[PDB]
Amino acid sequence: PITKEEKQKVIQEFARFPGDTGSTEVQVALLTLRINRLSEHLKVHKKDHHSHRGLLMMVGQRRRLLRYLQREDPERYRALIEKLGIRG
Amino acid sequence: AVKKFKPYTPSRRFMTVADFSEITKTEPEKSLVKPLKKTGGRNNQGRITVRFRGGGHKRLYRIIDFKRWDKVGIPAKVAAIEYDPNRSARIALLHYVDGEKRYIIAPDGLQVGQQVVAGPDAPIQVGNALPLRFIPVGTVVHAVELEPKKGAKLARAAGTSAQIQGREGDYVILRLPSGELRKVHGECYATVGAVGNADHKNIVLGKAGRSRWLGRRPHVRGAAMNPVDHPHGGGEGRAPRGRPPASPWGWQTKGLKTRKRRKPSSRFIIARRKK
RNA sequence: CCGAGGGUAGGGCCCGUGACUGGGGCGAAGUCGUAACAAGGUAGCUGUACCGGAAGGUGCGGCUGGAU
RNA sequence: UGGGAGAGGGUGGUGGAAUUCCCGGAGUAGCGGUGAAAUGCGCAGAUACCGGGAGGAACGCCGAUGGCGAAGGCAGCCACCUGGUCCACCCGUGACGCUGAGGCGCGAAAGCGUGGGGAGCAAACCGGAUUAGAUACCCGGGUAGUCCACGCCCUAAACGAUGCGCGCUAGGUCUCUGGGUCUCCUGGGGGCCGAAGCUAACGCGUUAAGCGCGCCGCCUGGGGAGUACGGCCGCAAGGC
RNA sequence: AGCGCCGGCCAACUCCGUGCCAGCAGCCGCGGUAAUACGGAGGGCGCGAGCGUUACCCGGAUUCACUGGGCGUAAAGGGC
RNA sequence: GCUAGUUGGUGGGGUAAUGGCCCACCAAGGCGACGACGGGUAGCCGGUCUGAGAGGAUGGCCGGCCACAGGGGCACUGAG
RNA sequence: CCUAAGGUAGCGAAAUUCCUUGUCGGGUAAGUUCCGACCUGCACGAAAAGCGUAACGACCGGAGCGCUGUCUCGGCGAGGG
RNA sequence: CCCUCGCCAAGGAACUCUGCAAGUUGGCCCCGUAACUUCGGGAGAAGGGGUGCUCCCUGGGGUGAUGAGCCCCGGGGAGCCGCAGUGAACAGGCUCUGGCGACUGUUUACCAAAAACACAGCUCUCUGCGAACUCGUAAGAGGAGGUAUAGGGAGCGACGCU
RNA sequence: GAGCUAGCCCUGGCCAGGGUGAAGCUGGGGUGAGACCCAGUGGAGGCCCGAACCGGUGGGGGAUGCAAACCCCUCGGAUGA
Ligand SMILES: [Mg+2]
Ligand SMILES: [Mg+2]
Ligand SMILES: [Mg+2]
Ligand SMILES: [Mg+2]
Ligand SMILES: [Mg+2]
Ligand SMILES: [Mg+2]
Ligand SMILES: [Mg+2]
Ligand SMILES: [Mg+2]
Ligand SMILES: [Mg+2]
Ligand SMILES: [Mg+2]
Ligand SMILES: [Mg+2]
Ligand SMILES: [Mg+2]
Ligand SMILES: [Mg+2]
Ligand SMILES: [Mg+2]
Ligand SMILES: [Mg+2]
Ligand SMILES: [Mg+2]
Ligand SMILES: [Mg+2]
Ligand SMILES: [Mg+2]
Ligand SMILES: [Mg+2]
Ligand SMILES: [Mg+2]
Ligand SMILES: [Mg+2]
Ligand SMILES: [Mg+2]
Ligand SMILES: [Mg+2]
Ligand SMILES: [Mg+2]
Ligand SMILES: [Mg+2]
Ligand SMILES: [Mg+2]
Ligand SMILES: [Mg+2]
Ligand SMILES: [Mg+2]
Ligand SMILES: [Mg+2]
Ligand SMILES: [Mg+2]
Ligand SMILES: [Mg+2]
Ligand SMILES: [Mg+2]
Ligand SMILES: [Mg+2]
Ligand SMILES: [Mg+2]
Ligand SMILES: [Mg+2]
Ligand SMILES: [Mg+2]
Ligand SMILES: [Mg+2]
Ligand SMILES: [Mg+2]
Ligand SMILES: [Mg+2]
Ligand SMILES: [Mg+2]
Ligand SMILES: [Mg+2]
Ligand SMILES: [Mg+2]
Ligand SMILES: [Mg+2]
Ligand SMILES: [Mg+2]
Ligand SMILES: [Mg+2]
Ligand SMILES: [Mg+2]
Ligand SMILES: [Mg+2]
Ligand SMILES: [Mg+2]
Ligand SMILES: [Mg+2]
Ligand SMILES: [Mg+2]
Ligand SMILES: [Mg+2]
Ligand SMILES: [Mg+2]
Ligand SMILES: [Mg+2]
Ligand SMILES: [Mg+2]
Ligand SMILES: [Mg+2]
Ligand SMILES: [Mg+2]
Ligand SMILES: [Mg+2]
Ligand SMILES: [Mg+2]
Ligand SMILES: [Mg+2]
Ligand SMILES: [Mg+2]
Ligand SMILES: [Mg+2]
Ligand SMILES: [Mg+2]
Ligand SMILES: [Mg+2]
Ligand SMILES: [Mg+2]
Ligand SMILES: [Mg+2]
Ligand SMILES: [Mg+2]
Ligand SMILES: [Mg+2]
Ligand SMILES: [Mg+2]
Ligand SMILES: [Mg+2]
Ligand SMILES: [Mg+2]
Ligand SMILES: [Mg+2]
Ligand SMILES: [Mg+2]
Ligand SMILES: [Mg+2]
Ligand SMILES: [Mg+2]
Ligand SMILES: [Mg+2]
Ligand SMILES: [Mg+2]
Ligand SMILES: [Mg+2]
Ligand SMILES: [Mg+2]
Ligand SMILES: [Mg+2]
Ligand SMILES: [Mg+2]
Ligand SMILES: [Mg+2]
Ligand SMILES: [Mg+2]
Ligand SMILES: [Mg+2]
Ligand SMILES: [Mg+2]
Ligand SMILES: [Mg+2]
Ligand SMILES: [Mg+2]
Ligand SMILES: [Mg+2]
Ligand SMILES: [Mg+2]
Ligand SMILES: [Mg+2]
Ligand SMILES: [Mg+2]
Ligand SMILES: [Mg+2]
Ligand SMILES: [Mg+2]
Ligand SMILES: [Mg+2]
Ligand SMILES: [Mg+2]
Ligand SMILES: [Mg+2]
Ligand SMILES: [Mg+2]
Ligand SMILES: [Mg+2]
Ligand SMILES: [Mg+2]
Ligand SMILES: [Mg+2]
Ligand SMILES: [Mg+2]
Ligand SMILES: [Mg+2]
Ligand SMILES: [Mg+2]
Ligand SMILES: [Mg+2]
Ligand SMILES: [Mg+2]
Ligand SMILES: [Mg+2]
Ligand SMILES: [Mg+2]
Ligand SMILES: [Mg+2]
Ligand SMILES: [Mg+2]
Ligand SMILES: [Mg+2]
Ligand SMILES: [Mg+2]
Ligand SMILES: [Mg+2]
Ligand SMILES: [Mg+2]
Ligand SMILES: [Mg+2]
Ligand SMILES: [Mg+2]
Ligand SMILES: [Mg+2]
Ligand SMILES: [Mg+2]
Ligand SMILES: [Mg+2]
Ligand SMILES: [Mg+2]
Ligand SMILES: [Mg+2]
Ligand SMILES: [Mg+2]
Ligand SMILES: [Mg+2]
Ligand SMILES: [Mg+2]
Ligand SMILES: [Mg+2]
Ligand SMILES: [Mg+2]
Ligand SMILES: [Mg+2]
Ligand SMILES: [Mg+2]
Ligand SMILES: [Mg+2]
Ligand SMILES: [Mg+2]
Ligand SMILES: [Mg+2]
Ligand SMILES: [Mg+2]
Ligand SMILES: [Mg+2]
Ligand SMILES: [Mg+2]
Ligand SMILES: [Mg+2]
Ligand SMILES: [Mg+2]
Ligand SMILES: [Mg+2]
Ligand SMILES: [Mg+2]
Ligand SMILES: [Mg+2]
Ligand SMILES: [Mg+2]
Ligand SMILES: [Mg+2]
Ligand SMILES: [Mg+2]
Ligand SMILES: [Mg+2]
Ligand SMILES: [Mg+2]
Ligand SMILES: [Mg+2]
Ligand SMILES: [Mg+2]
Ligand SMILES: [Mg+2]
Ligand SMILES: [Mg+2]
Ligand SMILES: [Mg+2]
Ligand SMILES: [Mg+2]
Ligand SMILES: [Mg+2]
Ligand SMILES: [Mg+2]
Ligand SMILES: [Mg+2]
Ligand SMILES: [Mg+2]
Ligand SMILES: [Mg+2]
Ligand SMILES: [Mg+2]
Ligand SMILES: [Mg+2]
Ligand SMILES: [Mg+2]
Ligand SMILES: [Mg+2]
Ligand SMILES: [Mg+2]
Ligand SMILES: [Mg+2]
Ligand SMILES: [Mg+2]
Ligand SMILES: [Mg+2]
Ligand SMILES: [Mg+2]
Ligand SMILES: [Mg+2]
Ligand SMILES: [Mg+2]
Ligand SMILES: [Mg+2]
Ligand SMILES: [Mg+2]
Ligand SMILES: [Mg+2]
Ligand SMILES: [Mg+2]
Ligand SMILES: [Mg+2]
Ligand SMILES: [Mg+2]
Ligand SMILES: [Mg+2]
Ligand SMILES: [Mg+2]
Ligand SMILES: [Mg+2]
Ligand SMILES: [Mg+2]
Ligand SMILES: [Mg+2]
Ligand SMILES: [Mg+2]
Ligand SMILES: [Mg+2]
Ligand SMILES: [Mg+2]
Ligand SMILES: [Mg+2]
Ligand SMILES: [Mg+2]
Ligand SMILES: [Mg+2]
Ligand SMILES: [Mg+2]
Ligand SMILES: [Mg+2]
Ligand SMILES: [Mg+2]
Ligand SMILES: [Mg+2]
Ligand SMILES: [Mg+2]
Ligand SMILES: [Mg+2]
Ligand SMILES: [Mg+2]
Ligand SMILES: [Mg+2]
Ligand SMILES: [Mg+2]
Ligand SMILES: [Mg+2]
Ligand SMILES: [Mg+2]
Ligand SMILES: [Mg+2]
Ligand SMILES: [Mg+2]
Ligand SMILES: [Mg+2]
Ligand SMILES: [Mg+2]
Ligand SMILES: [Mg+2]
Ligand SMILES: [Mg+2]
Ligand SMILES: [Mg+2]
Ligand SMILES: [Mg+2]
Ligand SMILES: [Mg+2]
Ligand SMILES: [Mg+2]
Ligand SMILES: [Mg+2]
Ligand SMILES: [Mg+2]
Ligand SMILES: [Mg+2]
Ligand SMILES: [Mg+2]
Ligand SMILES: [Mg+2]
Ligand SMILES: [Mg+2]
Ligand SMILES: [Mg+2]
Ligand SMILES: [Mg+2]
Ligand SMILES: [Mg+2]
Ligand SMILES: [Mg+2]
Ligand SMILES: [Mg+2]
Ligand SMILES: [Mg+2]
Ligand SMILES: [Mg+2]
Ligand SMILES: [Mg+2]
Ligand SMILES: [Mg+2]
Ligand SMILES: [Mg+2]
Ligand SMILES: [Mg+2]
Ligand SMILES: [Mg+2]
Ligand SMILES: [Mg+2]
Ligand SMILES: [Mg+2]
Ligand SMILES: [Mg+2]
Ligand SMILES: [Mg+2]
Ligand SMILES: [Mg+2]
Ligand SMILES: [Mg+2]
Ligand SMILES: [Mg+2]
Ligand SMILES: [Mg+2]
Ligand SMILES: [Mg+2]
Ligand SMILES: [Mg+2]
Ligand SMILES: [Mg+2]
Ligand SMILES: [Mg+2]
Ligand SMILES: [Mg+2]
Ligand SMILES: [Mg+2]
Ligand SMILES: [Mg+2]
Ligand SMILES: [Mg+2]
Ligand SMILES: [Mg+2]
Ligand SMILES: [Mg+2]
Ligand SMILES: [Mg+2]
Ligand SMILES: [Mg+2]
Ligand SMILES: [Mg+2]
Ligand SMILES: [Mg+2]
Ligand SMILES: [Mg+2]
Ligand SMILES: [Mg+2]
Ligand SMILES: [Mg+2]
């Protein structure tokens, strides 16, 4: 799984200010982390459809946040997806 | 995975070729090849004794090490995996730390860079050779000697394997690739794993020409011949067989068992093949 | 030059019709059985599959919209 | 951020019971099967009993009016990978929300392709019965298939015959799983019985079929017909 | 002065003839020897240089429902 | 799904006049689930008919506009 | 009644159909051939495989357009004899 | 009279077992192209336009050097002549529809090239290896320096549904 | 007797020119990642057209021949069994 440590580093790396958890950026980046692992997991467990749904739900969730953040502050979005290498 | 073709000629529509994925070195070891003397199916009297052979691609014989107990305890590195035209299996190049090089037939899963060894103490892992008596019952195994120090004789074809079923005295009991149950002596070497290139059987030759490249010349039906030639020969128009179906030499060919009756190894065969 | 249209050739859509053929509706004064409705006399229905003169049957899985 | 329950999903291993077949032993006149029989099996030694072995498939008790999942569905045990979900803290974001024509994915069983595998079961099929007849029901056999991998099919009484989300309108009792000041209270789930109210009735009733808003899908007499034609999908069967 | 109608819907009833025939008919339905339902007759009702039939439009049809319907079991929730 | 005078541009031709209305060149555009393209049907309106209304149906006569003049094409004359 | 069991799907006047130029339909002015059908299959039928099948064929049928000394129907000319 | 060859009025397959034979078509560039399909094809489908020479303007490449010369691939405009411009020579007639065989291949040297044989592919069967099988009295060989995903024999003959 | 012919074995040689344009690869698009679509590149094949070469389809001629199997026209294959 993801370790508290790995989560923190990400929580910390993306936070807008020291105590920040749950801002848009932190939210998107955490998802990106769970996304890229499941994605990897499914690459090997191609018949794990049940987890694939979750993936979709997350992919969905990250999308809405990105749509929000893009509406609210273009620069922040452009930077975020660029920080995480996201669009396609 | 076998490789398909788009149907851009009538023949490519069904032709499939091997993927050669495991292959890492495309030239044989110069000191391990010698010319194969092509026979055409002719014996030393010059007579065809096996019909319909001749005309295939030229081939160099790769010398294979079917003994292995030859170098007990000396490990080797798997240097490469190569194509061998003389067999269905691929062959693995071994660099012994001794500095001697040999070929073995390449087991499923052999990795280039890995190390193999032979002897009573060898780890029970893919690529190693031990006498059967030191191999855990249940393990699948290949290139098996049929009698001690006489060389690997069993399970050499692409994809094949034998499984150890039990032990009895000086002998272990194997399930052969045919499903025959047979006793083989405990002192006989076998190599752990199955033979690789297991997709070999899914190849579709695709055209007459490809059998031709394999040195397999056209085969003609007794039914298409005349009575001078064959039991099924002649008759006006097409004909059914008109007698029990027979070989060119007259022996019956649908069911007639042919194994010699009083044969000494009958004593060691527990159960004739399945299906 | 363009040009009504004419001519040559190949396409698309639609209507009529056709040896023969597939079922359908109806009629009813028939033949064969009795599948469903009662536990309907093998609970029924079901998607699928194989099979049978016929309703139908059986297998697999599902539903109760099943009597006791 | 702390925690929780669960047959949720995928992979790899792995345990015992039973059935079948084979081998060894011991034993003999029947066994099996039905409403009753017969076919069948059995002195070429069956059944029943002991020991050995082989192989596939399903996991008894626990087990529940239980649990998990969006549904289809999911059950021996172990590890790894992985989804959903609930609780407590009231720490962060600042309406970032609901639904969703198309599209995409998943989708019991049967079925299909290529390759495995095959103990038990069992369409088709053979035979015995039953019977007026018996292409059935019951009995003896039996091939696909049922099992695995990979790719297809895309249906269903795929049902709660009940689309999703939100808000509002008495309670009683049983239960699963949390957190409490653990008598008792407070969440989230599963049943029952009921207030108001609904409703053609039957029944529904904080798990609404009540009172309301949002969005989607669907209906408009029975048959003909889920048929025809066309189109799109499919290897086919066939699907929309 | 004519024409339709007189079972119910729908206002207007008896006699003969016929006997599941001949026939009526918009729907439901009448006729098988006592038919207010067929045909004639008497009588009655309705309109009147008109009366009735056929065709078609809207209405009744809140039966496409905006006004103003619905989907557990009636047709109707998409398999998720 | 449709489009090559197609969508825009520059220059010119033409007209009473704008305009791809016509041409030459240049650019690669224009349209479409808010339904293009295609098929079918219909001249449109004032009105008319019905209906409580909302709606439905309709466009005969009269008035307004359009279109046509055996089926097509064409220009001449002319304010037209 | 008989049999070991009585030909399934598909196909069928067929490279198989005797009667036969079967019958009906199509094409032609006219069609023993050809195509489509029907089915009383003399005497199809499932790996001496059954029924189909895009592409292929100096294979074997039938039709049309194009064009011609093939023909109506022959004439002239050339060169080698 | 025969052979090989050229032309032919009107007709145009009426010839004949049969368009046999001979005509027609004919290269290249451009436009355009149906059923059906295994999505490759069917396709050069079909059908049609262009094709010489002269002058003028102009685009790109190779070799040079980046330029000249030389050589290569074009584009646009205006003309000239003839019956006719791949002007001679070499160079598909096409379509529709059935049978058979899937297909490229093979064959009766010298009367049959096919529907015959072969063929990928499907199935049955034998074969545990000093294999089965074949040749040989034998030795020895083939099989195979292969080992059941292999080798022998037999039928069937891509593929689809069986 | 395999200097003909048939098969095989060893070793060499030959196959003008033109066309079609598989996989792959690169780039663009697409998606969560993908499948996949487009372009360019590429140069596959018992692929196409056609000489050499190998054949021998149909016709005509030849028929005490040029020839005990030839000639003319036509036609099949021509990187492959
Ligand atoms: Mg979420
Ligand atoms: Mg985005
Ligand atoms: Mg292929
Ligand atoms: Mg491919
Ligand atoms: Mg092809
Ligand atoms: Mg092909
Ligand atoms: Mg390989
Ligand atoms: Mg491989
Ligand atoms: Mg080499
Ligand atoms: Mg050397
Ligand atoms: Mg040397
Ligand atoms: Mg050798
Ligand atoms: Mg020798
Ligand atoms: Mg000799
Ligand atoms: Mg000799
Ligand atoms: Mg032989
Ligand atoms: Mg030979
Ligand atoms: Mg190899
Ligand atoms: Mg291979
Ligand atoms: Mg194969
Ligand atoms: Mg070879
Ligand atoms: Mg063979
Ligand atoms: Mg053969
Ligand atoms: Mg033959
Ligand atoms: Mg013969
Ligand atoms: Mg002989
Ligand atoms: Mg003899
Ligand atoms: Mg003989
Ligand atoms: Mg014979
Ligand atoms: Mg015979
Ligand atoms: Mg014969
Ligand atoms: Mg004969
Ligand atoms: Mg015969
Ligand atoms: Mg013969
Ligand atoms: Mg015979
Ligand atoms: Mg036979
Ligand atoms: Mg016989
Ligand atoms: Mg032995
Ligand atoms: Mg014109
Ligand atoms: Mg025209
Ligand atoms: Mg004219
Ligand atoms: Mg009819
Ligand atoms: Mg009929
Ligand atoms: Mg029943
Ligand atoms: Mg009944
Ligand atoms: Mg019943
Ligand atoms: Mg059923
Ligand atoms: Mg019957
Ligand atoms: Mg049955
Ligand atoms: Mg269910
Ligand atoms: Mg025993
Ligand atoms: Mg005895
Ligand atoms: Mg026992
Ligand atoms: Mg807060
Ligand atoms: Mg939603
Ligand atoms: Mg949808
Ligand atoms: Mg499914
Ligand atoms: Mg299944
Ligand atoms: Mg199945
Ligand atoms: Mg299967
Ligand atoms: Mg029976
Ligand atoms: Mg009986
Ligand atoms: Mg029975
Ligand atoms: Mg049974
Ligand atoms: Mg049984
Ligand atoms: Mg069995
Ligand atoms: Mg099967
Ligand atoms: Mg089947
Ligand atoms: Mg249910
Ligand atoms: Mg539910
Ligand atoms: Mg439903
Ligand atoms: Mg919905
Ligand atoms: Mg609703
Ligand atoms: Mg509680
Ligand atoms: Mg507690
Ligand atoms: Mg639940
Ligand atoms: Mg509750
Ligand atoms: Mg429950
Ligand atoms: Mg209740
Ligand atoms: Mg009440
Ligand atoms: Mg309650
Ligand atoms: Mg209700
Ligand atoms: Mg209806
Ligand atoms: Mg349908
Ligand atoms: Mg259906
Ligand atoms: Mg259809
Ligand atoms: Mg449906
Ligand atoms: Mg009246
Ligand atoms: Mg009235
Ligand atoms: Mg009254
Ligand atoms: Mg009378
Ligand atoms: Mg009377
Ligand atoms: Mg009346
Ligand atoms: Mg009366
Ligand atoms: Mg009223
Ligand atoms: Mg209305
Ligand atoms: Mg009405
Ligand atoms: Mg409403
Ligand atoms: Mg209603
Ligand atoms: Mg219903
Ligand atoms: Mg539902
Ligand atoms: Mg669906
Ligand atoms: Mg222009
Ligand atoms: Mg202008
Ligand atoms: Mg004017
Ligand atoms: Mg215009
Ligand atoms: Mg619009
Ligand atoms: Mg619309
Ligand atoms: Mg019109
Ligand atoms: Mg009109
Ligand atoms: Mg009204
Ligand atoms: Mg109108
Ligand atoms: Mg009118
Ligand atoms: Mg008017
Ligand atoms: Mg006009
Ligand atoms: Mg006019
Ligand atoms: Mg007129
Ligand atoms: Mg006129
Ligand atoms: Mg018998
Ligand atoms: Mg039968
Ligand atoms: Mg039949
Ligand atoms: Mg016939
Ligand atoms: Mg005939
Ligand atoms: Mg036939
Ligand atoms: Mg016959
Ligand atoms: Mg005949
Ligand atoms: Mg005859
Ligand atoms: Mg006659
Ligand atoms: Mg006629
Ligand atoms: Mg005729
Ligand atoms: Mg005729
Ligand atoms: Mg003929
Ligand atoms: Mg003939
Ligand atoms: Mg003729
Ligand atoms: Mg015929
Ligand atoms: Mg007949
Ligand atoms: Mg036959
Ligand atoms: Mg026969
Ligand atoms: Mg058979
Ligand atoms: Mg035969
Ligand atoms: Mg035959
Ligand atoms: Mg047979
Ligand atoms: Mg055949
Ligand atoms: Mg056929
Ligand atoms: Mg065939
Ligand atoms: Mg064909
Ligand atoms: Mg051919
Ligand atoms: Mg051939
Ligand atoms: Mg041919
Ligand atoms: Mg002609
Ligand atoms: Mg002449
Ligand atoms: Mg002359
Ligand atoms: Mg002359
Ligand atoms: Mg002369
Ligand atoms: Mg002369
Ligand atoms: Mg002439
Ligand atoms: Mg002329
Ligand atoms: Mg003509
Ligand atoms: Mg003509
Ligand atoms: Mg004639
Ligand atoms: Mg004649
Ligand atoms: Mg002919
Ligand atoms: Mg000819
Ligand atoms: Mg010519
Ligand atoms: Mg030419
Ligand atoms: Mg020619
Ligand atoms: Mg066509
Ligand atoms: Mg064709
Ligand atoms: Mg295509
Ligand atoms: Mg052309
Ligand atoms: Mg042309
Ligand atoms: Mg010119
Ligand atoms: Mg010139
Ligand atoms: Mg000139
Ligand atoms: Mg140079
Ligand atoms: Mg230069
Ligand atoms: Mg030309
Ligand atoms: Mg010349
Ligand atoms: Mg040509
Ligand atoms: Mg054709
Ligand atoms: Mg033909
Ligand atoms: Mg046929
Ligand atoms: Mg025929
Ligand atoms: Mg052929
Ligand atoms: Mg042939
Ligand atoms: Mg075929
Ligand atoms: Mg074939
Ligand atoms: Mg062939
Ligand atoms: Mg060819
Ligand atoms: Mg050929
Ligand atoms: Mg001969
Ligand atoms: Mg010959
Ligand atoms: Mg001769
Ligand atoms: Mg001869
Ligand atoms: Mg000859
Ligand atoms: Mg010949
Ligand atoms: Mg030929
Ligand atoms: Mg010949
Ligand atoms: Mg042959
Ligand atoms: Mg053949
Ligand atoms: Mg086959
Ligand atoms: Mg196979
Ligand atoms: Mg031997
Ligand atoms: Mg011998
Ligand atoms: Mg011998
Ligand atoms: Mg030897
Ligand atoms: Mg040997
Ligand atoms: Mg050897
Ligand atoms: Mg071998
Ligand atoms: Mg054959
Ligand atoms: Mg053959
Ligand atoms: Mg097909
Ligand atoms: Mg020779
Ligand atoms: Mg020679
Ligand atoms: Mg060589
Ligand atoms: Mg060549
Ligand atoms: Mg070439
Ligand atoms: Mg070339
Ligand atoms: Mg390819
Ligand atoms: Mg590459
Ligand atoms: Mg790419
Ligand atoms: Mg490419
Ligand atoms: Mg190129
Ligand atoms: Mg090429
Ligand atoms: Mg070729
Ligand atoms: Mg070619
Ligand atoms: Mg030449
Ligand atoms: Mg040369
Ligand atoms: Mg030669
Ligand atoms: Mg030859
Ligand atoms: Mg010739
Ligand atoms: Mg000729
Ligand atoms: Mg000749
Ligand atoms: Mg001749
Ligand atoms: Mg002659
Ligand atoms: Mg001669
Ligand atoms: Mg010649
Ligand atoms: Mg030629
Ligand atoms: Mg040639
Ligand atoms: Mg050719
Ligand atoms: Mg060839
Ligand atoms: Mg060629
Ligand atoms: Mg070629
Ligand atoms: Mg070739
Ligand atoms: Mg070669």
DSSP for B61-88, please give it.
EEP-----GGGTT--EEEEEEE--TTSS
Q: Which amino acid is at B209?
A: G
Cα(A40)–Cα(A34) distance, rounded to whole angstroms?
Answer: 10
Ligand 64 center from residue B275 Cα (angstroms): 26
Q: How far, in Å, is the CA of B205 from the C1' of nucleotide H122? A: 14
Q: Method of determination?
A: X-ray
Cα(B155)–Cα(A23) distance, rounded to whole angstroms?
Answer: 64
Cα(B93)–Cα(B78) distance, rounded to whole angstroms?
Answer: 6
Q: What is the resolution of this structure in A?
A: 2.8
How many Cβ atoms from other residues are within 10 Å of residue A72's Cβ?
A: 10
Q: Which amino acid is at B158?
A: A
Cα(B48)–Cα(B40) distance, rounded to whole angstroms?
Answer: 7
How many Cβ atoms from other residues are within 10 Å of residue A31's Cβ?
A: 19
Q: Which nucleotide is nearest to B184 (CA to C1')?
A: H128
Residue written as token pair 């007259």: B250
Q: Which amino acid is at A83?
A: K
- The answer to whether residues B176 and B154 touch, using CB atoms and an 8 Å cutoff, is yes
Cα(B134)–Cα(B136) distance, rounded to whole angstroms?
Answer: 7
C-alpha A70, offset from chain centre: 15
- The answer to whether residues B133 and B167 touch, using CB atoms and an 8 Å cutoff, is yes
Closest CA to B105 of B192, B199, B203, B10: B192
Locate B116 and state its tokens.
């193999």
B29-49 burial, b for 16+ CB within 10 Å, e for fewer? beebeeeeeeeeeeeeeeeee
Burial tier of B163 (Cβ tally within 10 Å: 0-12, 13-18, 19+): middle
Q: Which amino acid is at A62?
A: R
Q: How far, in Å, is the CA of B34 from the C1' of nucleotide D141? A: 60
Find the CATH number of the domain harbouring A3.
1.10.287.10
Cα(B6)–Cα(B13) distance, rounded to whole angstroms?
Answer: 6
Alpha carbon of B110 to those of A87, B73, B86, B106, B121: distances in Å?
40, 19, 20, 7, 20
Q: How far, in Å, is the CA of A65 from the C1' of nucleotide H119? A: 64
> Phi, psi (5° rounding) for residue B173?
-110, 120
- The answer to whether residues B140 and B153 touch, using CB atoms and an 8 Å cutoff, is no
Locate A6 and state its tokens.
């790995």
DSSP for B221-233, written as a single string:
-GGGS-TTT-TT-
SS3 B260: coil
Cα(B119)–Cα(B72) distance, rounded to whole angstroms?
Answer: 5
Locate B20 and state its tokens.
């050669």
Protein-proximal nucleotides of chain H (any atom < 7 Å from a CB): 38-40, 102-104, 116-121, 124-136, 140-143, 145-159
Closest CA to B141 of B103, B93, B167, B107: B107
**CB of B237 nearer than 7 A to strand G:** yes
Number of domains present in the structure of chain A: 1
Cα(B98)–Cα(B22) distance, rounded to whole angstroms?
Answer: 26
Cα(B30)–Cα(B128) distance, rounded to whole angstroms?
Answer: 25
Report the run of H or E that residue A14 belongs to, with start and end: helix A4-14
Domain range for A51 is 1-88
Taking the CA atoms of chain A, what radius of gyration do you get in angstroms? 14
